[PDB]
Amino acid sequence: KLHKEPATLIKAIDGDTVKLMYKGQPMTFRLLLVDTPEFNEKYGPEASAFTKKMVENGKKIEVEFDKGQRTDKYGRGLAYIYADGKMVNEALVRQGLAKVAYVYKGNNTHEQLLRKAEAQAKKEKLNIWS
Ligand SMILES: [Ca+2]
Numbered sequence: 001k002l003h004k005e006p007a008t009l010i011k012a013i014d015g016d017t018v019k020l021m022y023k024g025q026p027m028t029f030r031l032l033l034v035d036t037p038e039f040n041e042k043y044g045p046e047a048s049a050f051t052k053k054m055v056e057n058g059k060k061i062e063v064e065f066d067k068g069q070r071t072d073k074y075g076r077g078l079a080y081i082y083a084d085g086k087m088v089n090e091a092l093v094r095q096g097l098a099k100v101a102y103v104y105k106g107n108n109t110h111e112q113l114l115r116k117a118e119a120q121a122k123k124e125k126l127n128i129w130s
Helices: 044-057 088-094 111-123
Strands: 005-012 017-022 025-031 061-065 077-083
Touching: 005 044, 017 061, 017 077, 025 088, 044 077, 044 088, 077 088, 088 111
Parallel strands: 025 077
Antiparallel strands: 005 017, 005 061, 017 025, 061 077
16 A cells, blocks of 8 residues: 655755655655646646645645556656645646646556546546646
8 A cells, every 4th residue: 555754845956856865865746647738838827826735735645656566767756746735747647737648667556546547637627628
């Protein structure tokens, strides 16, 4: 089973990448199963702003690694990130500020939940889907 673990915000970087103190070591995390636009792309600043606000304003930030590979090729931790028990990955997709990403190395536990969010944001023609 997956477990949520505590972490502390160091700096929000963009829509899908965030730097956290995890077990007393600073690490860059990349959100599983979502792709936000890059800052210089349409909805990029909006996605960055969204993730920044959610993590900065949360009382408690948690990381939940999945069952597949835990780091990407660029050294980033691959997790679901929660702020006060709300998943940032899902919130971005349901807001139409990220699309669901390909599965990477077995990390698929929340794929269906995120696809459901995405279908609803698309039906609502929200943001990226506008
Ligand atoms: Ca991206």
